[PDB]
Design an enzyme around this catalytic site. Structure first.
Site, PDB file in Angstrom:
ATOM      1  N   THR A 113      18.851 -20.542  16.078  1.00  0.00           N
ATOM      2  CA  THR A 113      18.492 -22.309  15.855  1.00  0.00           C
ATOM      3  C   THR A 113      20.011 -22.762  16.249  1.00  0.00           C
ATOM      4  O   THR A 113      21.450 -21.825  15.414  1.00  0.00           O
ATOM      5  CB  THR A 113      18.840 -22.929  14.174  1.00  0.00           C
ATOM      6  OG1 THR A 113      16.954 -23.144  14.076  1.00  0.00           O
ATOM      7  CG2 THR A 113      18.620 -24.687  15.150  1.00  0.00           C
ATOM      8  N   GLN A 114      21.279 -23.359  17.856  1.00  0.00           N
ATOM      9  CA  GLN A 114      22.075 -24.055  17.678  1.00  0.00           C
ATOM     10  C   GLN A 114      21.977 -25.094  18.246  1.00  0.00           C
ATOM     11  O   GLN A 114      20.467 -25.941  17.844  1.00  0.00           O
ATOM     12  CB  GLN A 114      22.252 -23.340  18.634  1.00  0.00           C
ATOM     13  CG  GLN A 114      21.436 -22.333  19.988  1.00  0.00           C
ATOM     14  CD  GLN A 114      21.093 -21.447  20.768  1.00  0.00           C
ATOM     15  OE1 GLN A 114      22.683 -22.465  22.181  1.00  0.00           O
ATOM     16  NE2 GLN A 114      21.341 -20.415  21.246  1.00  0.00           N
TER      17      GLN A 114
END
Lengths: 240, 244, 235, 211, 233, 250, 231, 222
Positions: free
Chosen positions: E1-2
């Site tokens: 997740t970014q």
């Protein structure tokens, strides 16, 4: 980890490490199993070259696996402890998952499976041990007696012996044990077991151990004086 | 590859013996004699140091007799270095049991586990077995005073009196001859020393060549004391029994 | 010593060839395939008269439609049977159907050569795998420790194999009934067995589409032994 | 709505056939009884997939036990295989309300309730699902141990019907089973649409609905 | 997740009778609409395929390297690397599509929208789209971000259906693309005036137009607009 | 690839001998003489600096090593095997003691840990025993001054005085005659220099002899003041000059 | 002699004997033939039986719609290598939507076989393979040997008495190479080729095994009554 | 935070006849209020006379179809080119779906073909692999619009025999392929009118013993 294949095939199709394991069993003290009409008896030899022994604390030759099953053996004593521990753990594991104690046949099949696994696993040698596994299935009155050996083969026996001079005591049982009419009572069965050991032992003093297993987890070990009475009775009847 | 240089330490002979176990026992037979004698009111451990030198520090030395806990001691026969590995394991196993149950470990349970470690080295791993035989002297509230021995095979047995190491054949005959069941500790002390005195390969048995220990109930009311004898205390017990 | 996965100058694996010698020492096992079913028979060969012969299990159920007879180091077969049963049940779980006899055999043979320096040595046991499926009908397979399997109309393995196989060569035809096949297994077993054949030292089984895999009772086998003797005396 | 109860004539197992996604009625012909083996039955409540996949897998595990022990698995052992499996997955979000019902000579007729929290219970009567309360009200009121097989079958059918009516998330059809020493016997699929009006006419009940 | 930091805006593309056209502006957009010029978002892979990438620039440069890496790998032990066993648009797309989906399934996505424009070995036009979710679809016109909302409606007037592709010429398609780029400049805050356009034609090969600028813009009418309703001055 | 040697290279022979340990002790015998003497108020350890080449700077090669501020070690046998054992010994004094109890280990327990490392090289897979014998001299509050020998087997013994290596048999006889329980540290240094002169053949001076003591605390060598309980290391290596001073009155 | 204990030991003349012994397993194996034109590639295999009661060992394995091989030697090793080829063909399809080139198939088998000739404990593969396929560069025939040596050929044969069939194909080269758009005639040339490797025994209905792949022909295996046409 | 799921819209419809089965789907692919493609097929021939559609999140749908097609390929290799029966395919897909029970495929799966008696079969799956054989099933966006209509026109639910006082139900019977395609075409034109995510095109795959045939029909593009 140590990976080496120690149990391998020879040109003649034999596995020498498994066969040399049987030699270790032949060196072991004699163990006999006789099953009657409503009981099984396990007789065991104790070599008399060891005096100043503490019989209280010395590991007993017959081991309870559960309250209803017993295991005797011939061969390497240290090796026997590893099979007895694994068997005792599997007995409690079976009760936990199946909500029923092991059958004698199941406990035998497990021990034999362990003995087999050590004949084709890398880095390990076979168990120098043969076992007699005796007892009564839960809620069953039919006596059970099984034998295992280092290769991992197992089978059921009316009566059977293993260890040193076993061929002599097997000879005795083969003519003295009637399939059509087995020992009706406990006394008769214990007597035939003691008689069969007296062909090999030497003296009937602190050299013979007897363990009587009956239905519904009724296992008792006989004392010196109790066993000594059978020895005294057999020798007086012999002189004829 | 590496298969060429493998001794295969965990295989059977055609006769069904374990080579490395048999050869380890041969090693132990050359080690200084250790004797354990169990009496009705205590246990004696007596051991002979291996050919002492005059400049060896005797008083601050531990070769033969080790403490496992407050109730259990061992006499060693074989490689000292190997024994110390196993002793530290046994000391930890005893404290693990105490931590778990809040009860001192029963003697047989400690012996069985230490014996099971030795067994492992004969059945798997491809390593040499431990060149060590132990005499276990201990007390618990179940069986009272107990003597055991273990050897590199991982087999263990109980005894009223036993010897390990050098001249066990000779030592066991002398113990079997003079031992009786209603024996006292003071009597067992005298037997242990007299036995070493006759089996020893040395000219004369002296304090400086001995390690000695007793497990008595000599402390006040239902408690066990472990006495690892000092040099001066061995000197005194050696004069009192009339060996010097 | 020498490597476990080593080739001979002739181009064979030493350990596989040596295991085939172990299988020759094993008790005899015979399979006969027909259009009415597949019959499996074995020599029990008790080492002593005190040994309870009914406890000798050398014929084994894998699924309802697949049976198994073994010859050699029979202890080695336990994990092979376990794998076969797991493969049969697992395939039924994944595909909601019976697993092909060939596919089950191929699964067992994939273990065979999973040895080296995986397990330490090849298996010292040969299997006769008999079954039925909808596609290829009644089938008999011979699974070796080499990882190779052949389909057979009839096959003998064990001590009396080369003699029994020569007898099956003459006796087998494509129009054999199940009753005829039962008597033929019993006939050839009695020929190659050391001790005299009875219901206690020999065991029969069959797999039919209708009733699946069944191990015959001693009472049933006894009647077929009595029927066999009368018919051989009749001419 | 699923119920299973013990009586003189064996075990009665009755289930509905409705499956819902929110307020959406996804199906009315779902089989909430898995047949495992000829003397073993499993009911399904909660997640449709969780119940269908882990009870089809329980039949595979039960078959393996009979191949290895040459004997049919006990209701106790079969129930514990499933309960021990779901306990491994505890906290992962499995949702299951299941009843394992069967007869064996050594146990007799036996019912085990097993759920995804790991609860395993032996009992004479169980009702599982959103409609369990409605089923319980009818069963408990008319339950006798010495019920006839014909009356017991009807009571199970009637108890599911009651739940199908009052519970929004239960309905479609009623599936009936009877379990004795000879095994389990299917007593057919009864569409609630036709059944409701028949029961109302014959019984004289269901007076709350516009007759 | 970014979370994407520096991003590229819409990539627009369409098919014509003899090939495909793809275009993308050369701008890197920061946090609160801060701008940065100098970012090529058209990746020519071989001489029959152009890859247009939108979304995170860092993830774009990673994908750029994968495609350069892929071409090198295909040449290894390949005598027909410049002929029959040359990389195809369908191969390049499927590789990228595979990577995007397994990255989303590991919950570490490449924050991009990709259009693979090319001509296959048999002369078939290839146009397909993949994004950070691994979602894929093909159409006669394809666009990402704002382009999907504003460019697609203009391009679909030229090629509404498959049957319109043979009737559409490269002159018409290029005009449509160039007009659509001006509309995006008018209405997209993250767009730039400078853009790159690539044409892949089966007959004429791959033409790559760089440093292009939006021209013939209408601003004159702005002088007449005063206030927000009632203001007359 | 990988270490396939997971089996013992040291095994029991039919006679019950452990060959590789016996052979390791033979390597120690070939080694240069080193000795240790315990006094009432200190311990001395000494050895010859056998210089491989005269171009070599014998100062750089240190045969006598500080293990803790109060424990020092000298060896006979294979120098490289000693160097890595010193490294492992210093580290184990921290990891298995100082980082737990906040104090340096007593002599007998650090010796015990060195012994353990050497026992493992005797039984572990794919390794030979260490070809060195160590003399470890140390002080600790509750045991006072002590001197230990450690052998390739992993066996250790406490000594009043001893010698190992080339001329150990002759050296031990010399020490038996000279040693008493009333020796002061200076007397033990004197005896050490006399004992070592017998086993040395070539030049005998402060440049060819390496000698260290476990004696009084050295505040000057601590490197800081202000903590009264910290009084400095008991281990001191004697200088080239300090040795030559004691060779004049010999 | 002293240098044949394992695959990690060179001989003083620079030979790997364990590899050369693995190569020997192939010579003992039953004969199989491979040959191709510009349009089609054909495998012909002589299947071997244990006895008259037994089935005939299957020699030909399908790897994809456009590729498959015939085996000679250890059948289980052919199963391991064919399974590996199936996965590599499958990987190429799933990841790149690309049919695996027959040349790349060769390179992958070579590199897999090689690792088993340089590592202690493992053994070389004891089987030889003839891979046929139709890819983007037309028809292809490969010869695999468990040394790792893979070779692209117009035709070849491996197994017992293979030299007979290999000599025939060497003579016939100019004829069978131009059999374009005629499957039956290319098979006939393959059946006449394998016939040069027969002794005493002749080609029967359940004995012969044929496989073919080409321009508009998926890899299909013909056995039983389906090969009766070519006897 | 990154959301790994999306909705690509679309709706699918399976109907089983006597000796045939149909699987229909619209060809429109959407995200939010945009059209991605007017023609993106999501009903696939998988071989062995099995047609499949995984409607919902297109990436998960493509992934599952790809994996099942691959499952069919490896079934042939491992079981001597045996034909994968529709019931066996259905069980296989349960295991594929339940494999990702704790990171599910956001698709409603429908497969159609013939059973082993040659009779029309339709199987429908939830996202985590619970499955059921059905005569009739609609899936996706407009399932709620199509399904009650099929209950009425296929299974004749709530229809009684005129004059019988609502005592005798309208008798069940098999519909012809011609009559089924009419209901499919009317189902989708109806759903197109009232669901914004449905339209552009309708692709029907018909499965008989003769094989798999395709029919395409235009839908409104608004």
């Amino acid at each position: 980890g140590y990976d080496r294949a120690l149990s391998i095939f020879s040109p003649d199709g034999h596995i020498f490490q498994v066969e040399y394991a049987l030699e270790a069993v032949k060196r072991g003290t004699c163990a006999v199993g006789v099953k009657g009409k409503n009981c099984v008896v396990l007789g065991c030899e104790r070599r008399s070259t060891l005096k100043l022994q503490d019989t209280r604390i010395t590991p007993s030759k017959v081991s309870k696996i559960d309250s209803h099953v017993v295991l005797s053996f011939s061969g390497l004593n240290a090796d026997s402890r590893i099979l007895i521990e694994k068997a005792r753990v599997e007995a409690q594991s079976h009760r936990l998952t199946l909500e029923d104690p092991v059958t004698v046949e199941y406990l035998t099949r497990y021990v034999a499976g362990v003995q087999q696994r050590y004949t084709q696993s890398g880095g390990v040698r076979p168990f120098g041990v043969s076992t007699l596994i005796a007892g009564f299935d839960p809620r069953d009155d039919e006596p059970k007696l099984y034998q295992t050996e280092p290769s991992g083969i197992y089978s059921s026996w009316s009566a059977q012996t293993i260890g040193r001079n076993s061929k002599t005591v097997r000879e005795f049982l083969e003519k003295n044990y009637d399939r059509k009419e087995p020992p009706a009572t406990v006394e008769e069965c214990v007597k035939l077991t003691v008689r069969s050991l007296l062909e090999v032992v030497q003296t009937g003093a602190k050299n013979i151990e007897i363990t009587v297993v009956k239905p519904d987890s009724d296992i008792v070990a006989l004392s010196s004086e109790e066993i000594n009475q059978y020895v005294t009775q057999i020798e007086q009847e012999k002189q004829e | 590859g590496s298969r060429r240089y493998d001794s295969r330490t965990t295989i059977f002979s055609p006769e069904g013996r374990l080579y490395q176990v048999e050869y380890a026992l041969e090693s132990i037979s050359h080690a200084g004699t250790a004797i354990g004698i169990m009496a009705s009111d205590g246990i004696v451990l007596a051991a002979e140091r291996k050919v002492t030198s005059t400049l060896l520090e005797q008083d601050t030395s531990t070769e033969k007799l080790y403490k496992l806990n407050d109730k259990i001691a061992v006499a060693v026969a074989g490689l000292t270095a190997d024994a110390e590995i196993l002793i530290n394991t046994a000391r930890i196993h005893a404290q693990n049991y105490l931590k778990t149950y809040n009860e001192d470990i029963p003697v047989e349970i400690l012996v069985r586990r230490l014996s099971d470690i030795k067994q492992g080295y004969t059945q798997h791993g491809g390593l040499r077995p431990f060149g060590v035989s132990f005499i276990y002297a201990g007390y618990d509230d179940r069986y009272g005073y107990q003597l055991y021995t273990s050897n590199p095979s991982g087999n263990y047995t109980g005894w009223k009196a036993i010897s390990v190491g050098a001249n066990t054949s000779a030592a066991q005959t002398l113990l079997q001859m003079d031992y009786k069941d209603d024996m006292k500790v003071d009597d067992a002390i005298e037997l242990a020393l007299k036995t070493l005195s006759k089996t020893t390969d040395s000219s004369a048995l002296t304090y400086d060549r001995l390690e000695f220990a007793t497990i008595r109930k000599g402390a006040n009311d239902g408690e066990v004391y472990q006495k690892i004898f000092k040099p001066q205390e061995i000197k005194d017990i050696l004069v009192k029994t009339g060996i010097t | 010593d020498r490597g476990v996965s080593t080739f001979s100058p002739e181009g064979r694996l030493f350990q596989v060839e040596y295991s085939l010698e172990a299988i020759k020492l094993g008790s005899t096992a015979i399979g006969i395939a027909t259009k009415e079913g597949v019959v499996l028979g074995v020599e029990k060969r008790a080492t002593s008269p005190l040994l309870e012969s009914d406890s000798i299990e050398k014929i084994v159920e894998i699924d309802r439609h697949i049976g198994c007879a073994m010859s050699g180091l029979t202890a080695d077969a336990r994990s092979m049977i376990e794998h076969a049963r797991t493969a049969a049940v697992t395939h039924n779980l994944y595909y909601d159907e019976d697993i092909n006899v060939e596919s089950l055999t191929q699964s067992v043979c994939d273990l065979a050569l999973r040895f080296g320096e995986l397990m330490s040595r090849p298996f010292g046991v040969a299997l006769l795998i008999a079954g039925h499926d909808a596609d290829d009908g009644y089938q008999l397979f011979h699974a070796e420790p080499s990882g190779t399997f052949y389909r057979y109309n009839a096959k003998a393995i064990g001590s009396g194999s080369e003699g029994a196989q020569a007898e099956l060569l003459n006796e087998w035809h494509s129009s054999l009934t199940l009753k005829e096949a039962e008597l033929l297994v019993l006939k050839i077993l009695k020929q190659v067995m050391e001790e005299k054949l009875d219901e206690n030292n020999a065991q029969l089984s069959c797999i039919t589409k209708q009733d699946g895999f069944k191990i015959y009772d001693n009472e049933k086998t006894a009647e077929l032994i009595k029927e066999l003797k009368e018919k051989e005396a009749a001419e | 709505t699923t119920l299973a109860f013990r009586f003189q004539g064996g075990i009665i197992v009755a289930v509905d056939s409705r499956a819902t996604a929110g307020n959406w009625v996804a199906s009315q012909t779902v089989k909430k009884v898995i047949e495992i083996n000829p003397f073993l039955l499993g009911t399904m409540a909660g997640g449709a997939a969780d119940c269908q996949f882990w009870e089809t897998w329980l039949g595979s595990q039960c078959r393996l036990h009979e191949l290895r022990e040459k004997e049919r698995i006990s209701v106790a052992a079969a129930s514990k295989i499933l309960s021990n499996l779901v306990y491994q997955y505890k906290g992962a979000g499995l949702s299951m309300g299941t009843m394992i019902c069967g007869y064996t000579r050594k146990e007799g007729p036996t019912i085990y309730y097993v759920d995804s929290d790991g609860t395993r219970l032996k009992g004479d009567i169980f009702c599982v699902g959103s409609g369990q309360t409605f089923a319980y009200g009818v069963l408990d009121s008319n339950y006798k141990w010495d019920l006839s097989v014909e009356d017991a079958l009807y009571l199970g059918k009637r108890s599911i019907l009651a739940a199908a009516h009052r519970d929004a998330y239960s309905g479609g059809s009623v599936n009936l089973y009877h379990v004795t020493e000879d095994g389990w016997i299917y007593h057919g699929n009864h569409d609630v649409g036709e059944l409701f009006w028949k029961v109302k006419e014959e019984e004289g009940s269901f007076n709350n609905v516009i007759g | 997740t970014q979370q994407p930091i520096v991003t590229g805006t819409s990539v627009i593309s369409m098919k014509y009778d003899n090939g495909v056209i793809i275009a993308a502006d050369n701008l890197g957009s920061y946090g609160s609409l801060l701008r940065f010029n100098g970012v090529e978002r058209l990746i020519p892979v071989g001489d029959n395929t152009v890859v247009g990438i939108s979304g995170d620039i860092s993830d774009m440069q990673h994908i750029e390297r994968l495609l350069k890496d892929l071409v090198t790998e295909n040449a290894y032990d390949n005598p027909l690397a410049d002929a029959e066993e040359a990389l195809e648009p369908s191969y390049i797309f499927e590789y990228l599509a595979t990577v995007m989906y397994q990255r989303r399934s590991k919950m570490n996505p490449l924050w991009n929208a990709i259009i693979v424009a090319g001509v296959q070995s048999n002369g078939d036009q290839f146009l397909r789209y993949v994004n950070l979710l691994g979602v894929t679809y093909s159409s006669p016109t394809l666009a990402t971000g704002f382009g999907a909302h504003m460019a697609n409606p203009l391009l679909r007037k030229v090629v509404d259906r498959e049957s319109d592709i043979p009737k559409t010429t490269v002159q018409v398609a290029e005009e449509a693309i160039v007009n659509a780029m001006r509309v995006l400049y008018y209405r997209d805050a993250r767009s730039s005036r400078n853009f790159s356009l690539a044409i892949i034609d089966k007959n004429t090969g791959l033409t790559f137009k760089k440093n292009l600028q939006v021209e013939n813009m209408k601003w004159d009418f702005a002088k007449d607009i005063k206030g927000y309703g009632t203001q007359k001055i | 690839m990988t270490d396939r040697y997971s089996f013992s290279l040291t095994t029991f022979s039919p006679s019950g001998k452990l060959g590789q340990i016996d052979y390791a002790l033979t390597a120690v015998k070939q080694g240069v003489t080193s000795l240790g003497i315990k006094a009432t108020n200190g311990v001395v350890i000494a050895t010859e600096k056998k210089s491989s080449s005269p171009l070599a700077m014998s100062e750089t090669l240190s045969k006598v090593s500080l293990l803790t501020p109060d424990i020092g070690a000298v060896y006979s046998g294979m120098g490289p095997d000693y160097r890595v054992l010193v490294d492992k010994s210093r580290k184990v004094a921290h990891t298995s003691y100082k980082r737990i109890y906040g104090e340096y280990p007593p002599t007998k327990l650090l010796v015990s840990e060195v012994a353990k490392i050497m026992q493992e090289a005797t039984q572990s897979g794919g390794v030979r025993p260490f070809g060195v014998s160590l003399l470890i001299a140390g002080h600790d509050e509750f045991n006072g001054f002590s001197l230990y020998q450690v052998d390739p087997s992993g066996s250790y013994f406490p000594w009043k005085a001893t010698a190992i290596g080339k001329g150990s048999v002759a050296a031990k006889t010399f020490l038996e005659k000279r040693w008493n329980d009333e020796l002061e540290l200076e007397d033990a240094i004197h005896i050490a220099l006399l004992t070592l002169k017998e086993s040395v053949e070539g030049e005998f001076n402060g440049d060819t002899i390496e000698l260290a003591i476990i004696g009084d605390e050295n505040p000057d060598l601590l490197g800081y003041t202000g903590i009264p309980t910290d009084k400095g290391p008991r281990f001191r290596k004697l200088t080239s000059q300090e040795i030559n001073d004691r060779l004049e009155a010999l | 002699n002293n240098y044949d204990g394992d695959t990690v030991t060179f001989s003083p003349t620079g030979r790997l004997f364990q590899v050369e012994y693995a190569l020997e397993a192939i010579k003992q194996g039953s004969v199989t033939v491979g040959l191709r034109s510009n349009t089609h590639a054909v495998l012909v295999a002589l299947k071997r039986n244990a006895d008259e009661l037994s089935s005939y060992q299957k020699k030909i394995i399908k790897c994809d719609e456009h590729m498959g091989l015939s085996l000679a030697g250890l059948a289980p090793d052919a199963r391991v290598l064919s399974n590996y080829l199936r996965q590599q063909c499958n990987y190429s399809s799933l990841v790149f939507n690309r049919k695996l080139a027959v040349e790349r198939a060769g390179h992958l088998l070579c590199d897999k076989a090689q690792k088993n000739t340089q590592s202690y404990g493992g053994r070389p593969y004891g089987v030889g393979l003839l891979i046929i396929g139709y890819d983007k560069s037309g028809a292809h025939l490969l010869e695999f040997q468990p040394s790792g040596n893979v070779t692209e050929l117009y035709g070849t044969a491996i197994g017992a008495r293979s030299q007979g069939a290999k000599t025939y194909l060497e003579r016939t080269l100019d004829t069978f190479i131009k059999i374009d758009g005629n499957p039956d005639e290319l098979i006939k040339a393959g059946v006449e080729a394998i016939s040069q490797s027969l002794r005493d025994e002749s080609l029967t209905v359940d004995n012969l095994s044929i496989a073919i792949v080409g321009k508009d022909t998926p890899f299909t295996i013909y056995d039983g009554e389906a090969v009766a046409k070519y006897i | 935070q990154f959301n790994p799921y999306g909705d690509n819209g679309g709706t699918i419809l399976g109907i089983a006849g006597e000796d045939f089965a149909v699987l229909a789907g619209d060809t429109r692919n959407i995200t939010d209020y945009s059209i991605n493609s007017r023609y993106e097929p999501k009903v696939f021939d998988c071989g062995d006379n099995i047609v499949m559609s995984a409607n919902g999140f297109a990436a998960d749908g493509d992934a599952l179809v790809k994996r099942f097609k691959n499952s069919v390929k490896w079934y042939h290799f491992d079981h001597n080119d045996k034909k994968l029966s529709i019931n066996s395919a259905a069980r296989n897909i349960q295991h594929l779906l339940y494999g990702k029970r704790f990171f599910p495929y956001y698709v409603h799966t429908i497969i159609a073909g013939l059973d082993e008696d040659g009779k029309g079969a339709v199987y429908s799956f939830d996202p985590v692999g619970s499955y059921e054989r059905e005569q009739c099933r609609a899936g996706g966006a407009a399932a709620s619009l199509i399904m009650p209509f099929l209950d009425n026109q296929v299974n004749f639910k709530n229809q009684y025999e005129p004059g019988t006082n609502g005592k005798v139900k309208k008798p069940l019977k098999y519909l012809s392929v011609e009559e089924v395609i009419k209901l499919v075409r009317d189902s989708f034109t109806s759903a197109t009118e009232r669901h914004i995510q449905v339209g552009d095109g309708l692709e029907i795959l018909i499965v008989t013993k003769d094989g798999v045939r395709k029919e395409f029909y235009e839908l409104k593009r608004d």
